[PDB]
């Protein structure tokens, strides 16, 4: 009886902030999308929405789960890593945490 999954997003990992060797800039983040390994592949995901989903302590308005929303802005480097801009910068304790790259602005 429906042994299938329900995933409609591509998974990614929050690698770091945009930075030099010593100076970091939290306003944009670096995202590694699964299976995206070049700029040509990364171009498909430009403009796609991204959610960082985490859990908090208090239940505020029917849930303990909070979301930070952003979108993919441009590719980064040559290996498919992308730059993402969120409404607020990501917590920076989430370096290595998972994010969901939606398909909401499709085609």
């Amino acid at each position: 009886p429906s042994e299938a999954g329900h995933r409609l997003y591509v998974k990614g990992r929050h690698l770091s902030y945009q930075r030099g060797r010593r100076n970091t800039h939290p306003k944009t983040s670096l995202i590694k999308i699964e299976g995206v390994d070049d700029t040509a592949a990364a171009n498909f995901y430009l403009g796609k929405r991204v959610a960082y989903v985490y859990r908090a302590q208090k239940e505020v308005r029917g849930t303990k789960i909070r979301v930070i929303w952003g979108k993919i802005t441009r590719p980064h480097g040559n290996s498919g890593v992308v730059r993402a801009k969120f409404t607020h910068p990501l917590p920076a304790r989430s370096f290595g945490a998972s994010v969901r790259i939606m398909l909401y602005p499709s085609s």
Binding site: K11, L15, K32, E34, G35, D37, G96
Partner: protein, 203 residues
């Protein structure tokens, strides 16, 4: 690229520094890694070169109190690899400590990671990285010569696990033969329409 729950790396045939670099990058990216058979890792160059490097390492020690602060020289092959990885990890931060906690290293193949799929890293494999004819040594041999005390125990346990794996492999071959026979027999009972459709689709 693919995100796994945990990646088990069979350390045999890998170059220590390159595997350490790859593993450190994965750990900082958030991947969990278990490296087995750290005594079968390889270092390029002569074993005399490796031994001289470790002797130079051993010479370092805090002068005023060798029980604190000084470089603590770990003899086991998994600990040699762990030192190599910690060199590439920013271990003095909380983020680096978490990255290192995402890692496990062992000599031989302990039972949990026995009966599990062990990956390889082609960017660090000796056969793919070293010119044939160049000298190389074994981290297990270096550890044994610098004071690691369990080379023979690991060898005996690996022999036992390889005998068990040989029995498994025999039953696996039997299962493969039976599955091939089953597919051949069922090829005459499925719809030819289904068969042609799958063949056209590429299956």
């Amino acid at each position: 690229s693919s995100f796994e729950s945990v990646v088990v790396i069979d350390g045999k045939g890998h170059l220590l520094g390159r595997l350490a670099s790859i593993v450190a990058k994965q750990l900082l990216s958030g991947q969990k890694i278990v490296v087995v058979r750290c005594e079968a890792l390889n270092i390029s160059g002569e074993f005399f070169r490796a031994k001289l490097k470790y002797h130079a390492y051993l010479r370092k020690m805090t002068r005023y109190n060798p029980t604190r602060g000084g470089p603590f020289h770990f003899r086991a092959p998994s600990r040699i690899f762990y030192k190599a990885v910690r060199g590439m990890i920013p271990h003095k931060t909380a983020r680096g400590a978490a990255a290192l906690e995402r890692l496990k290293v062992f000599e031989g193949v302990p039972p949990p990671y026995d009966k599990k799929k062990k990956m390889v890293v082609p960017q660090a494999l000796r056969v793919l990285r070293l010119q044939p004819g160049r000298k190389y040594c074994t981290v297990g041999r270096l550890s044994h010569e610098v004071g690691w005390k369990y080379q023979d125990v690991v060898a005996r346990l690996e022999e036992r696990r390889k005998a068990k794996g040989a029995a498994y492999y025999e039953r696996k071959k039997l299962a493969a033969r039976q599955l091939s026979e089953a597919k051949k027999a069922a090829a005459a009972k499925v719809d030819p329409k289904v068969s042609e459709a799958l063949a056209a689709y590429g299956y």
